[PDB]
Amino acid sequence: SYYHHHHHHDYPSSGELWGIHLMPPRILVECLLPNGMIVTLECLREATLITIKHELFKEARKYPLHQLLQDESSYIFVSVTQEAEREEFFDETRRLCDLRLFQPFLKVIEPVGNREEKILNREIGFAIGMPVCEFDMVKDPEVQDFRRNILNVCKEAVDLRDLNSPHSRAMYVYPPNVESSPELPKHIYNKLDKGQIIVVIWVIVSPNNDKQKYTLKINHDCVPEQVIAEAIRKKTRSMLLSSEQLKLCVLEYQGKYILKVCGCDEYFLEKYPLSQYKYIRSCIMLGRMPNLMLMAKESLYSQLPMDCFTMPSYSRETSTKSLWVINSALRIKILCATYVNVNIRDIDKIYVRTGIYHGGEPLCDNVNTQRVPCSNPRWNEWLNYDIYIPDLPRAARLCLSICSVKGRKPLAWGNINLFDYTDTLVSGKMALNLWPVPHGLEDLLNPIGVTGSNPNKETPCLELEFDWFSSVVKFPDMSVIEEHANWSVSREAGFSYSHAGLSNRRENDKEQLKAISTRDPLSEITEQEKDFLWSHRHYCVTIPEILPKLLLSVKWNSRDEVAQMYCLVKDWPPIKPEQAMELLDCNYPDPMVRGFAVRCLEKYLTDDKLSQYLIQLVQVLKYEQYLDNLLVRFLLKKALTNQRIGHFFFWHLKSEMHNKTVSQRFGLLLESYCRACGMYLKHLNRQVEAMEKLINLTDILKQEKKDETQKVQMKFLVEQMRRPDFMDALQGFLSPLNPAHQLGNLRLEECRIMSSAKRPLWLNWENPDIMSELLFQNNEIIFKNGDDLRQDMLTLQIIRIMENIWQNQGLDLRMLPYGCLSIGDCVGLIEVVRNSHTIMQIQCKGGLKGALQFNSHTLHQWLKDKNKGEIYDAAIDLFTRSCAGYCVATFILGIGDRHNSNIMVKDDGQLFHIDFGHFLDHPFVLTQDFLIVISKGAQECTKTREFERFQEMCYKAYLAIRQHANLFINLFSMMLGSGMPELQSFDDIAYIRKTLALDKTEQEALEYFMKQMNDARHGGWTTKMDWIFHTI
């Protein structure tokens, strides 16, 4: 992260022209002149447009009609890009190979629409990966309303940025990178053991770039203002000066300086105590001295160009019955399909299956008659559902398919919201383009899939007729639902006794039985309990955390109950953001429920925690029925309030743009974000350019007949990176892994294709910060193209959260959740952890003898060297600690097929754990090598005191995660929406429900885990024989 986790113990595919990856060093380009003539010009592929134009108008003077030509500078180029648009190139600084041309030609025009600026925000098109204006004629009114109505959010955010001109704009661009709690866990505080810290403060002095420093000893809970104050007091000592002048000096210059971390773009712009900053806390951890740079506010403030937010171009009583006046049962007419793709091998026939759903389904679903020659898909029949129309819940939808199962003795699906984004009940003729069935699915219906017609019209297409009543039918207002709830609550007490389970309101003391708030989100609830809960819904307002369970007890196909639920929800006590997130997954489609959830977030989510769970909150946007909702408003606003949040909001959305079921929703969102983010769009565009070159590069190496010997691929790589277009694109941009890291110039000698199977790119940038190398780092990232990196990403998130829980319980286990970002369809970046080696790489090195002779003690021997006596104890403790952590996380998560190339160790003793891939099965390690490092002694190390302490950390850590099962269940639950093979349904999450006991006692669990562990089996492979193939 900051320091490479190094403890100091002593303290649609792309590519350059259509059909071609790489355009030849020289090419002919046709120029369509404005005087009507076409002239072909010989160009270098890296030629800038400025020089191409200059050449064009030089050589045009040799062709007919030269006199009808205006000056060189009167025109601009225009061409077709391989995204099929007419792009105008205003930035004539751009190189030929960079314009994403479809064909080698340009057209010469006079700048029409003469709003150079609005057109120039074509920068949005590029960042998004889609031409803005594909939006401009979509026609769907929901879309066009979203574009208009979401601009309010932009306006508010942009205003809330100039509320206090210079400082609030700094806060947005450089937000405090701070923990959620000021209070400091015992083991971290104790590393101070006075309650105070030694910090070094650096100043860059008169142009000589000379660097004076000041060592201060300060209370860990000092605000940045007070560290600066202590820095003034130090400097001012030397000048003598009277007190009172001393006192006037501090008082009037404290707020005139600013603190920066040395070697990355992080600032201390807020009055949080020093040790609440992640960097300071990390310094304490690592046994490092905080290095801060002192800097005038004016110098930071002067270099924050910002201002321009402009409202874009798109800124311009009927017959209505209420839903609950319609006196009929719901029916839907199934007309006909255009076609389905089956031969007729055996006419197992086609039929449309339909269901009315709330994720869980308000009724028994029905098929039409197997009326089919497959030749003609035609039914023309009304299907009758057993649900009264007034009973239809707001988030009601129709989920249908055409399929097959077989009789002893699939095909195409689609979902439709029964209501609009305007609360209109659907009526009339309706055509629906169907979706191809997901790989691992055979369920006849797919209600967890997206809503609305397939964008691709070259697909099976079902025609439906919805009932038309006298007029437009609308869902009733809250200001009528409320009235109905109060009425039916008044009916309750007039009843005599009742003999039906959903009975009552006294209330007995046996209601200790409502300590089922304690039960996990997938514990599941008997019908008795569903009826019990609903009967006592009024006493629940005193145990707020049962809300999700109560919500699963409600009969959503009952207007009487649902109205009452809205009432309870309306003034429900707030719940911790962790629990509110549960309410945004697929089990809770109702907008009232979700509105409550978003309100918890707006109140109790720190920016820290939002950052932590952003991956989940982005995914959860897919379960929302409508484009405009309170969750996009919330996220988008935070994204535009906090650039750190904004950065990953961008990449998480961008990384899924290839996915057609989500393109429009995410593109629309990205469009509004990009339009309002300010100057970061420029930095984002630089990041997207970089990534596109890398993608194109590793595409050539992956297919384009490049599968020759590693050395050959290296020749190609070295040639391409030296080319000016590549130099320009891949130097001087922010790291998508962490935007606080500037990536300067490439170190070409250190850049390599790794000689693994997957052969990823290892890239190395300089750190262009003044106080970098000599105080911080140089910068290494893997570019992976080919493997889905989402699983790694999720795993690394969970590890970071696990570590958090332990570390805040005073259980000091160190994990290494290195950076990992999926940036597109199987494209991603991985942080390189410096000074680390795989167990295998250690075993292979000499082992203070030579060659490839190891044995089980080699790991320990390697660590004993490197941490020569006295620092040694630390190394062993760090190893023991980290080892414990991964031993438990691995087991809980079911990360199997570990081995000596999967596990790395650092020079300081820290262990982890790379290259995850597989999830919950789809286990328990402890190698003898590790056993020997814990302890030190010979074959006897399963009965040492060190081993017992180790087992204790494992027990304590297992139980901690167990206590926070719920977070993890919900985190995995929210992630069910994406296309992860290991997370298609709730039954996949069941794995951790078993790994952590859950349906047992804490006491039975501990025992279960103990058992898993005291088995374990140990040993390891060691020169003896077959450490290569593993024979015996």
Add this chain to the structure above:
Amino acid sequence: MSLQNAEWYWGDISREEVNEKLRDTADGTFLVRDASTKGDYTLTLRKGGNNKLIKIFHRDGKYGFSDPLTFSSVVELINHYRNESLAQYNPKLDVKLLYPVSKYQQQVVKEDEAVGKHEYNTQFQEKSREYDRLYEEYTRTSQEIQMKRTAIEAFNETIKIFEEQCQTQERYSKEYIEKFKREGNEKEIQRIMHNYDKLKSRISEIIDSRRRLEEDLKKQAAEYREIDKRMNSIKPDLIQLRKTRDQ
């Protein structure tokens, strides 16, 4: 005997295992299972397309759903509601326990790899290997196809631009072809007409380039529908092994 070997007592099985057994099954389908915290037992009944978990409470050697526990053997309880409607326990459940699952379907297996076997377990691998193959080829084609479609769109815009170029040079040439014939200046008219015949010829080239792409696309579209046709032939056979194979 008694409870331990009734058709509908599965005991051992988990929550997931039941859901697969009750998929798309008619109202009245049920099984009894061990509870996850071992009353001791769970009834899982199908109604309205859902799977209802009903507890069986075992207090003092008597069974039931709620505190007037009339029954005393579980088999006594379950058989009661085979004949009687469940409406006398909560009116909304008017259904009867009509259809047992039966732990007799098609050989005492799962007790002792290829050893404890073997014929159409291996057939699965083959059909499953082919399903993989086809689904891959299927998604590649799909995306291939999309690329061509945006390429056709790119060609349309290209041609449109080149068509405009003639409409450009006939605006500018027409009032110069007649200005040069004033000077009796031909051959200059020849150079102007040389460009015209390069541009006209170029349009034919692009137009053909698209048309060639078009007949490749509809050929691929045909190929795609074929992959799908073959896939929908293997789906309802790959499942019909799982049914014969596992149980």
